[PDB]
Amino acid sequence: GNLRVTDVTSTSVTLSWWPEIVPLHGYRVEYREAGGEWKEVTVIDRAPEYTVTGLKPGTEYEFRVRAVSGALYFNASSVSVTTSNTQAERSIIGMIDMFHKYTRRDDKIDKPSLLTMMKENFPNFLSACDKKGTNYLADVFEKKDKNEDKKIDFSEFLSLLGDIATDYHKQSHGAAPCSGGS
């Protein structure tokens, strides 16, 4: 969520995430000079700030980020430093990036990570489900893991969004949250 520079020195750039109140369980930070060669560095557990160093004073530096699931973030990213996307489009790109904040190398999410994402991304909806006396996290994985691989690929994750999206449209028409006797 908005990849931003928070301090710049003559050979050290600092970057922030501000993701799900927490980053992605791993994030590559690629960087090159203006017409440079991409240098990578893999940060780990939920570190929301990373500072690059060793750079050249008064030099143009490009940056971009990837996921454990070998894939880029922020659309295609690319910021620059010297030492027209519509709301709906951006709303799309973020959701992919949300997937890619929990997926491991395979680009799929395990039950541990899924229940995390839920809690950090859809908290008021989960709370809602409690208030009525529904435990969504019980049978979410088994429901949306139709293929029973014990892994949520994008496809399976979309079907989830689809179920939440539904609720919100229901809620829009005025349906008390977490409706689904099913």
Add this chain to the structure above:
Amino acid sequence: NLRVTDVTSTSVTLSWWPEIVPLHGYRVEYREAGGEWKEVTVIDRAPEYTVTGLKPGTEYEFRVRAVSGALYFNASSVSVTTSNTQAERSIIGMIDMFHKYTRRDDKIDKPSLLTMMKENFPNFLSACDKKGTNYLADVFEKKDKNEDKKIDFSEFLSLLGDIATDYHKQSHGAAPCSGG
């Protein structure tokens, strides 16, 4: 999340957002403190609307709902005297963006549907022109699975499934507007 670009002692000019284009049939609602929910339908994409004949120096509330009877924001409101996660919000705005184009039946017609895409997914469509693949050519007839000449919400999502699946592939390197 409705802007208030002016207030006088007896008037309130409300305003929409950023894109020179609002809904196409909004219904506005407002009341005193403890007040009575007065309404005023507004057919037309009238981007600003000035409510009039108000009590001076009074705490009013204002809200919106849609031609698709009932909705807008998170059923939020604004107040004047004369929250959610990015994910939870990113949904709500997509519901709003839905209802922004539906008719009083909560369903999107084909010309309505083009406008939605041209207004909310221009750069996506531009990419398909780079290649030269008219994305709008078949989309409705395609997505309108029930052949009711009407896109409904479950069909809208599907479409979004098709938009977001590509943006997925892109993130993993694939050309924009790949296919299948």
